[PDB]
């Protein structure tokens with residue numbers, strides 16, 4: 001949820017409705033709506049980092065995020081709208 005996203009420092013770079021540095025979270029939910037393993041896929045990107053999906057600015061690995069929190073964040077992102 002938003003509190004967890006704040007606690008794990010996701011909000012420096014992402015808001016729900018609009019693009020900041022990384023993509024708007026609802027835009028992530030929209031893109032992955034039909035991907036079956038979307039939540040585990042996104043949790044993997046949160047833990048390990050991402051580049052090239054949205055631009056050439058990489059998201060660094062979020063080394064302080066626990067497995068359970070990465071999955072809770074991915075799950076929450078997917079519900080957005």
Ligand code: HEC
Pocket residue numbers: 005008009010011012013014021022023028042045046050051052053054055056057058059060062065073074077
């Ligand atoms: C700036 C330093 C960021 C921080 C802190 C967080 N995110 Fe990020 N994220 C950022 C960028 C620039 C990108 C695009 C990377 C790319 O491939 O072009 C992303 C991407 C994501 C994604 C999408 C990955 C995908 O394969 O589509 C997710 C799901 C995501 N970010 C989640 C996320 C979370 C939960 C964060 C807090 C732990 C977080 N990001 C921090 C920039 C930054």
